[PDB]
Amino acid sequence: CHPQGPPC
Amino acid sequence: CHPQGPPC
Amino acid sequence: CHPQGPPC
Amino acid sequence: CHPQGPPC
Amino acid sequence: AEAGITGTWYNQLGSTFIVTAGADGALTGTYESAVGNAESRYVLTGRYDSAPATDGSGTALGWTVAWKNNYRNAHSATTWSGQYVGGAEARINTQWLLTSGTTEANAWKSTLVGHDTFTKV
Amino acid sequence: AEAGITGTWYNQLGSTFIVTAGADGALTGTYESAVGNAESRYVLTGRYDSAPATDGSGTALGWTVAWKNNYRNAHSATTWSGQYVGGAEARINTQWLLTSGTTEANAWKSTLVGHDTFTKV
Amino acid sequence: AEAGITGTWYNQLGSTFIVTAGADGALTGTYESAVGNAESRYVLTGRYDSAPATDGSGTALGWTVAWKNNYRNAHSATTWSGQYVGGAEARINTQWLLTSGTTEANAWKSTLVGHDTFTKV
Amino acid sequence: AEAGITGTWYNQLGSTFIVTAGADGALTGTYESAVGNAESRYVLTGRYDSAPATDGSGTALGWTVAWKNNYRNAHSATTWSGQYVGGAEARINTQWLLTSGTTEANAWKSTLVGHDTFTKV
Numbered sequence A, B, C, D: 001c002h003p004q005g006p007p008c
Numbered sequence E, F, G, H: 001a002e003a004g005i006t007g008t009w010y011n012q013l014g015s016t017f018i019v020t021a022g023a024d025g026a027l028t029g030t031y032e033s034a035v036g037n038a039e040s041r042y043v044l045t046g047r048y049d050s051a052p053a054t055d056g057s058g059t060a061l062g063w064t065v066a067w068k069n070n071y072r073n074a075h076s077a078t079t080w081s082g083q084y085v086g087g088a089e090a091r092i093n094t095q096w097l098l099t100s101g102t103t104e105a106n107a108w109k110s111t112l113v114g115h116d117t118f119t120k121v
Helices: none
Strands: E007-011 E016-021 E026-032 E041-048 E059-068 E073-085 E091-100 E111-119 F007-011 F016-021 F026-032 F041-048 F059-068 F073-085 F091-100 F111-119 G007-011 G016-021 G026-032 G041-048 G059-068 G073-085 G091-100 G111-119 H007-011 H016-021 H026-032 H041-048 H059-068 H073-085 H091-100 H111-119
Touching: E016 E041, E026 E059, E041 F041, E041 F073, E059 F091, E073 F041, E073 F073, E073 F091, E091 F059, E091 F073, E091 F091, E091 G111, E111 G091, E111 G111, F016 F041, F026 F059, F091 H111, F111 H091, F111 H111, G016 G041, G026 G059, G041 H041, G041 H073, G059 H091, G073 H041, G073 H073, G073 H091, G091 H059, G091 H073, G091 H091, H016 H041, H026 H059
Parallel strands: E041 F059, E059 F041, E059 F073, E073 F059, G041 H059, G059 H041, G059 H073, G073 H059
Antiparallel strands: E007 E016, E007 E111, E016 E026, E026 E041, E041 E059, E059 E073, E059 F059, E073 E091, E091 E111, E111 H111, F007 F016, F007 F111, F016 F026, F026 F041, F041 F059, F059 F073, F073 F091, F091 F111, F111 G111, G007 G016, G007 G111, G016 G026, G026 G041, G041 G059, G059 G073, G059 H059, G073 G091, G091 G111, H007 H016, H007 H111, H016 H026, H026 H041, H041 H059, H059 H073, H073 H091, H091 H111
16 A cells, blocks of 8 residues: 555 | 657 | 566 | 767 | 457547457557558557456556558657456556667667557547 | 577576567567576567668667466566667667556556666677 | 646645745655545655746656655655646646665566646646 | 765766765755766755665665756756665666656657666766
8 A cells, every 4th residue: 555556 | 740649 | 476587 | 969968 | 358459449649559369369450640541550569468357457468569661661669568458448558668769879868658548439 | 680680689687588570570489587498488579660771770679578378377468669789799778668467446556667688698 | 837836736546746846946845645644745856947938838847755754664766757737727747657675686676657647626 | 875875976878966865865966967067067856765674675766857057958857766775886776757848749759768877986
């Protein structure tokens, strides 16, 4: 849930 | 007017 | 061990 | 002679 | 995929391609840039990876066009890499790399990158 | 090019490919990742752009491998885009894009980029 | 650009960034991934190339976000490269590269590529 | 990293950059293309992701140079994305994207891709 993606 | 672009 | 890498 | 290349 | 891939695909910029997805992974057909004339038709060839899928994944594929036909030799080739997603609004989402033949001093600026989405409509 | 391209090419990472450059732009052959076993051999297909050249330019080419054979289905395909430079130390310098089939939530991280140089030695 | 660039920008995937374009080429601000919480805010920094333009060109720019803040360290950084086009429907069209820290055996799959469009709306 | 990153780095093509890695993720310094003259020096700015590492991973980083100084305005910017690996033969391995400001008809060929390795030597 890599910070560049949605959410997270 | 490279063949990949528009037109040509 | 994706087929593009070493080994596999 | 784009500044990223050699020389310039 | 296979049956879903075969057909005609259009992108945002006016281009068309027609491809057959053959049973053991092969893609073949032609790319036409514009105007509606034999002079903008180029051969494509690629591969796709057929998969037993339980979870709604795309099918990975790729093809190459060298920009030389009987009316034009642009001293370059483009590859597209991406995936087919079937269904109502089937699309092929791709990223592409275009390399031109250069002298070795210019090799470092030989390759453009971008992206295209193709739809059936 | 054509005659210069046909043969066996090796990269920095241990991989091999064997390709025939056929007269009207076609490239065909096989890519083998490693070990030395039928299981790492995959089909490639691509195109190259043949040019009358007066100034030492590379020949632009591209090919695709889908990573599925009879022993492995990795749900992905790689395209390489670059140019052949002939001569003493002939090389094919490329950049590549590897896309895996993903769900549409993961589509944004479907595609890796990198580069390879292949030599005859 | 400069005045046109400063503000809040949104992409297709839910992300927000706020940037100030400072007079001598500097971009500074923060990128927030999602949820609406301090934990998804990361520092950005970049540059843009200011130009006297007579023909409707975009302004070239680029910025970097390292994905480490006080609540998260994802062992990676993304750079975006593209151009601002002002006017009614101002957008920043970009391509991006995300690299993760890897061991040297995995270095070859360290870097993802893709693209984003940001709008003011 | 941090202490390891600060210093002077050279690539294969003749370019130099000098960077300071500041304690909370910041990279700042200057990129000089060639000749050995104020005219080829451009500002860089980026970020790196500092990590507690137990297994020999690279540190992910990225920086941007806009190609405008007091002697040159090339209407473009480059971002580099990659990782620092320390030790005997410390290197920063990167992939880069260079975008030029274009008209919207030429936007599709605005962005070049390639790669550089920088060493301390």
